[PDB]
Write a protein that binds this ligand. Sequence first.
Ligand SMILES: Nc1nc2c(ncn2[C@@H]2O[C@H](COP(=O)(O)CP(=O)(O)OP(=O)(O)O)[C@@H](O)[C@H]2O)c(=O)[nH]1
Ligand SMILES: [Mg+2]
Ligand SMILES: [Zn+2]
Ligand SMILES: [Zn+2]
Ligand SMILES: [Zn+2]
Lengths: 57, 69, 1456, 171, 172
Amino acid sequence: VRKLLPESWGFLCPVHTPDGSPCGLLNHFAHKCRISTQQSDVSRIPSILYSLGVAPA
Amino acid sequence: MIVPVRCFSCGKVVGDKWESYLNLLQEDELDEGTALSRLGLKRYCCRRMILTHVDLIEKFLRYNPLEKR
Amino acid sequence: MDISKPVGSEITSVDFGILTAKEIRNLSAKQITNPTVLDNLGHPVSGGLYDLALGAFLRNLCSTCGLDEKFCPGHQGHIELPVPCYNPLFFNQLYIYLRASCLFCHHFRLKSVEVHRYACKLRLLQYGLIDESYKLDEITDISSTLLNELKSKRSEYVDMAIAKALSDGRTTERGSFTATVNDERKKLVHEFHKKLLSRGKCDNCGMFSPKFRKDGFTKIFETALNEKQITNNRVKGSTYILSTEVKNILDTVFRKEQCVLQYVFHSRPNLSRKLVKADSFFMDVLVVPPTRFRLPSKLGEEVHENSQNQLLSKVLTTSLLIRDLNDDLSKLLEDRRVIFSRLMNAFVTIQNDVNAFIDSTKAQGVPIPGVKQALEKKEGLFRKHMMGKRVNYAARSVISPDPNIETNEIGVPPVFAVKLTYPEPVTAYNIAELRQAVINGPDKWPGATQIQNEDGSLVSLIGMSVEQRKALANQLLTPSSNVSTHTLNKKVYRHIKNRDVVLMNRQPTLHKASMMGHKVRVLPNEKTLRLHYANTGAYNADFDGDEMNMHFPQNENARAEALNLANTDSQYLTPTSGSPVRGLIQDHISAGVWLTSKDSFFTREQYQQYIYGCIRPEDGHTTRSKIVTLPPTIFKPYPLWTGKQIITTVLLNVTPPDMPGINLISKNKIKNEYWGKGSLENEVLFKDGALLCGILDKSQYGASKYGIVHSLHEVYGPEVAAKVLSVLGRLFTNYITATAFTCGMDDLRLTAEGNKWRTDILKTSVDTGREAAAEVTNLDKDTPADDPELLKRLQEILRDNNKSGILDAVTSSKVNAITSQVVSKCVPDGTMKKFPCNSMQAMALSGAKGSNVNVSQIMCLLGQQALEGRRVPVMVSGKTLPSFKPYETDAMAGGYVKGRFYSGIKPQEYYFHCMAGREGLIDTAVKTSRSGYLQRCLTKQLEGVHVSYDNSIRDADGTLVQFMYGGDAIDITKESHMTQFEFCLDNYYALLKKYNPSALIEHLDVESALKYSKKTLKYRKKHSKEPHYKQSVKYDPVLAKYNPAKYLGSVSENFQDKLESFLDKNSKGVNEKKFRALMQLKYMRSLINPGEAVGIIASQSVGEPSTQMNVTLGIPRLREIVMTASAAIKTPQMTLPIWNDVSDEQADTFCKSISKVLLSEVIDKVIVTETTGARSYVIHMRFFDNNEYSEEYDVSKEELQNVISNQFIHLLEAAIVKEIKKQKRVEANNNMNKVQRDRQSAIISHHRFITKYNFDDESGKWCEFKLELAADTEKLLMVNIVEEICRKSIIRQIPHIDRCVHPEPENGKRVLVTEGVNFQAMWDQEAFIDVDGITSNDVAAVLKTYGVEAARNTIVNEINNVFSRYAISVSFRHLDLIADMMTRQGTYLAFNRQGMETSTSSFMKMSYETTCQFLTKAVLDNEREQLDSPSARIVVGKLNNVGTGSFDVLAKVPNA
Amino acid sequence: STRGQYPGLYLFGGHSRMLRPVRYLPLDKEDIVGPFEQVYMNIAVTPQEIQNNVHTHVEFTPTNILSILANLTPFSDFNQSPRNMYQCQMGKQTMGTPGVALCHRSDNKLYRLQTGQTPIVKANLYDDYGMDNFPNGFNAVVAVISYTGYDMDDAMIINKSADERGFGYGT
Amino acid sequence: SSRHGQKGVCSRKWPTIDMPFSETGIQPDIIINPHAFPSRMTIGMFVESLAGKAGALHGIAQDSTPWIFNEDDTPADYFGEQLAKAGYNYHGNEPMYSGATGEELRADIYVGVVYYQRLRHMVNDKFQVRSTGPVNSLTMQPVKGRKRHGGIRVGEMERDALIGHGTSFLLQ
RNA sequence: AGACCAGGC
DNA sequence: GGCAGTACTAGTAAAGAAAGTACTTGAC
DNA sequence: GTCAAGTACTTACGCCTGGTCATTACTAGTACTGCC
Ligand SMILES: Nc1nc2c(ncn2[C@@H]2O[C@H](COP(=O)(O)CP(=O)(O)OP(=O)(O)O)[C@@H](O)[C@H]2O)c(=O)[nH]1
Ligand SMILES: [Mg+2]
Ligand SMILES: [Zn+2]
Ligand SMILES: [Zn+2]
Ligand SMILES: [Zn+2]
């Protein structure tokens, strides 16, 4: 869990992480990693997936 | 916070050159290297005082508890 | 402590007994009775917990002694528990004797002659008669007349054997209790209690007793007798029971069997002849502690009562409810049942309160801690306030580095010089300087803060003016007006001067050189400690914010130990390897390269300035009272000196005269090729104290063996080598402040040719990641990266963890051979600025600071970023990173970064280098905590082992570990130049002065040990061609017969066989016999002194190098060997010596016959076929071709048929029946021949539900067999069954051996390593394996088949090569004692709480862990201990028996 | 894929996601992607490393992967990586300037350096977060030299007449 | 501390007349050891010295956001030519004298203006002393704590070091 | 005197 | 003028992702 | 008598400096006030 996995490219900072006991666990975001804080407009996406070729469930 | 009197590495008096520096960048449109050379700051220890001074006292002075606001 | 207040009485021993109820009614000050602690208006109520009879409480006099708060010691009180309750320390043993005993005749349920068999074997183990207890057992439904004749002769044998052994000088009437008779007594009582608990009927009168039940604590139940065997209790002509009745049973059982239980509860003979009683296991009276020890905490108004007062109130609350429940019974069914069902509930709650007061984990109802849990762990009492303590007279501050300090001194601040103080008693030789100190005052160094009068009184100087303070200066040396205090004098607590001693200390104190005794020198300016640079590697101290402790010793016995014994000049060599830890570090090593160069020429003013800047005769560094110089190197045109000639006269002034100069031929770290062509500056040369050739380096001064400071330590002494490190530390500091040293950006550049060499090699790395991928994937060569077969198998590699390891080890093996081509070519040959001017190379080659791999990553390329063995991890998609496409075969894409720190690394190179950097910061964190508990388990066992005056190392209680330390009794810190015979011959006349042969003959026996050393040397050259089992030796070595510390020439046999091998070869006014007479004197003075804390040193020499850290390896291997002593070893092996007759082809077809073959390893696929509606199955297991597995596994076609016939189906028939039980909650014909129809018929007959069977008899490819079931059964999977059976069925297996590998021949010999231990089965293979050379890894299996001394030899080599893998040299004297301590009982014992139970010291076992488990085992044994162990002499405050306290001091008084 | 992650098309539009801007190469504009989304696509770190028909996106800058403190250590691709990791721990333990409303604060312990400076050597993100409002250090004439003997292992010295003039002074 | 991981306490406030001085007349206000660089490999502090000094001569701020330099255009080539246009050298070295002896030193000294940081770990928050003081109530041992004039602890790992030297009166 | 949190080496 | 309702008061009672041995209950 | 997994009690670097928040419900009582 303390390792620097490559999936954190652009989301967690590779270098800004403390030493010793919090090493690897406490870590900081990248400065452009925004976090979504509102549920987005979703309700028109199944109407425009059925036109692209999706058989309905 | 406020401009350092008597720069740290040699001892040249530097604190009388802040308001002359902002004059020679705003009215007389000089770059920062010509203005430090016109004020007599030749050694690069003397140059990095006026060049890199933040003048943070102008941000402190807006909190005056001795006056209505 | 006050040295002017003696003490005549001493505690000799302690012994753990049970505190009876009759004593603590006479012991008690006042019985306390109500559960109110303190009433209103802040007073303590009389009769409660806070009481004035229990001690003075809160500004109020005591009611027992009448003293105030400062002088009342506190007094014992008690409560009266109304019913006898269960003591939770003894309930696990009370429940043993409550069981296993008859309730009718009140013996045990054993026969009375076998209870007597343990009554008199334990009597023989109280005395020192470990061997007579087994002769007693050799004495032999049955009438009860000969049993009295049997009990008579066994009792007469004991009374004769005790009488004989006590008469024949062996055993005291107090008995003998060693360690190995504690083993035989613990083995005998555990066997006795185990046999008591397993009895059906009472063997004295034959009828049953109802079995008791304990679900949890606080309660006991007995069960009703069965409905069948009530008949036995009619032919002799569930229930909760009370603790008064449990006591009523065992007050009868312990009386009917008094003659036996006296020996179970006594380790030593009971000279008091007290009865053992059942009141021991119960407690009818709680003892409340003194009220001093339960004062309440206070934080402003937030005052809370103590936890023990909360627990003792709830006992008193129940102790009054249980009396108020006796109101109705005193007055007297419905009026009787509700008052009795509420009384019985008070019995349980008063038990649950007396448990929770003693043990918090035996409570129920985050809980309030009891009295057990104030003792147990770290933050207990043995470990937080006994073995470690807070101390007075001690400072701690940040350290700052400091030259101009004489390498044995510390620099103390002024504000530490004011506060810390020392008691000087005034004498006739103090009132000059100690009158001046008391005039100066508390705030003027050197001053004084207090005067202690003769009466014990103490006058402070703080609030005093100077006129009042000069009058007390005339009061010091006055005759006392009191006759009772006429021999006492005043003590002036003066400040710390420059002559005092100081004990410095930096955590973690991993070894004893991390806590040294420094001298003092006060400094005027700032508030920090000042440490010289030769001490910075012994404490492991850097100066980025280290703070370290300063303990100031308070008497002359301690000042004489941190100046002579714990001194920092005595700690030059560490006892781990014998290598120095002290030396100059970074700037001084970079300056001796420039000073001792050929270019350094100094004029007459420069040459004489550097000498007085370092010698300074008035401080006492010279030895001539005048600085002597040399003639210059050059006389014309003007005189010039050399930096060789600087250190020649630096060493000429600090050396003692009339003793010749040093002679040394050594080498250094810088090669000859860095100084040009024909250079000789690699070899250093000292001839009569004159440096004639060679640079001076880390190898000469610095922590490194056989340099010039290490050689000055040997020939001249430790006081010289500590002075040379001061003078050279000032010679190089003064050389640096006039001729400095810089590293810049100029030092990091390559040439335009070297950058061309760099990029042309790295263009060959663009195809390296593809060649390594094409090799592992088993394509041939030259396949493109976008090949769909290359990308298919690389996806197959990623999904497996082992296939990805052999891809990350082939690419890393190829790209690190491209890294090794740039470092070999571009440095130093392609660098712009070169040595000596290249300061980046100049301090990496000289060992000042840096490595060759550090200048590689700076100037050439940074390399492969290796993770924990592997390369950079890959995502699920086959991408190593979002920048790189999936599964590309690039070296850069997998962690090999080509950019260097000079010109930068790319953002994907930066992210790979951050993965490897975080790996180092976790291994620096998580792997410095695992070695800390290795050393704690080691030091607790080995705290008391030490050299005796017999030169025979042994434990504190007296049991003997070894007969001689290392076999030769020579100290590791004194045996460095012992076999450096070419060094000691060149320095003969100067080493003869320090050993002084002529003045050291009278107290010796020169004549006798030399003769018997020739009787054995002539015998061993004549014999000893035969191996060791034939050698009836007829002669011991001179160490086993003669004392080597007294008899000259009593040396070891390697020292004799290497001196007679040296002195035979070369023939060089010293003759042959005066050199062998001075090495035997050098040997005898290099003996180890008696009293050395060897096992601490032996356990610090393993725990401290452990922080530097297809088989298990490292600190997990040391836990398997040392700490756990596991017989369930993780990866056992066995090394098999191949004969010279069998070749490499006869050896690897041999390892195919030992390594196991599973049935799973031979099967291609298994196709079941189920048709239901009798559930049918067609199990068709398809193999590989017969030419494929008879070559690979050497399995024949017919042997594979026998595994299916006799082994596979008998495991398959079981797995089908096991599941039906647990669910109740193309090919040939059928008329083939007569034998296959009867081969089928035998399979059907001997198995349960087979109806058909046929093997491929002509080709060995398939095996099909029908397998019917009943129609009642539901569905089984029958593929997950078959796969699990096919992995457990074995074709061929030697038991406990799973693989046999033929590795490459390491170090000449031919080696065959297995992966499992079976020594019996490898003895049958004499024709292939040398059976008398089979070494192994399983230390517990070599003990079972080859014995104790073979396991002792095995454990030394296995604890050796865990340090030899990391190139860590720890000597075979520390590994010898850990071996002989772990096998000291003939078994393989661990360094843990299970392996230390056989030990005499009770406080040692109680201090380590499980404190109140060793506490109960001591008080049950009534165990007296002699206070021998170092952990037992700190609990009771005794001087140790190790080192300085290993003897007494007597004073010769002239008059009678 | 053969034995990989379970396939499917997963759309996410809810709260608490992790999101970073990235530049999308057909019709060059901004795209916002997530960690579950990024593991199967091919972004490039600079537009001089785009390979044809494999790269869908590029980053706007390689320095949008580092944090606030991580972008402000200068020339960070020349340092060994633990010494960049040590700086992010030690860049936020300095005696700097906490604020300018200290007359209206009542915090129990506060560290204020008197005359801070802006560096000659700074990132372009320095003047973008307004770290000139909070100067956490000072420019110092640093000579890399073994001259003194008092600064060998890890230590350092100051000119004595420098902090007679206020060099590194704080309350 | 610098902005690169190069921490370290102050050893002495070395006086101006004892410090090295250049030919331009300046004196450094920080001395750092060159032996802190090879094992640590912080070349961002070397190139901050060229970038800081060449910006102090011209009155300009050079940016240092990472990966603005390739392997083709090394910043040591970039900031060296800025120092060479001002009169200083391409490598960032200056000819300095000694303060004690006054002689010309051997090589030119690597100088420059880098940005230091003052950490909050002063001595005054550390640095405890005790001769005697308050004790605990039930052990009569000194109190844990610097600000209560309390003592330091000699634990188990320091107890056996006093055993291991064989000094039995230091342990008592 | 504990809990949790932030550090130091 | 004194009665009873509330709102308070101070009063005393309840509060989930590691290693090893050792004991022992399970069936047979 | 016994194997046998199952259940139970144990440790898990050193010491060093800071800061914080650390009893709650309720229950019966004396007093305050609105009222007739
Ligand atoms: N017992 C412990 N010792 C520590 C701890 N942290 C630091 N130290 C000691 O302080 C020293 C710090 O060394 P570092 O961790 O910084 C390893 P580093 O690569 O920075 O060495 P240098 O590069 O030579 O400075 C080290 O010798 C340790 O003995 C710790 O958590 N526990
Ligand atoms: Mg350090
Ligand atoms: Zn200046
Ligand atoms: Zn008393
Ligand atoms: Zn009986």
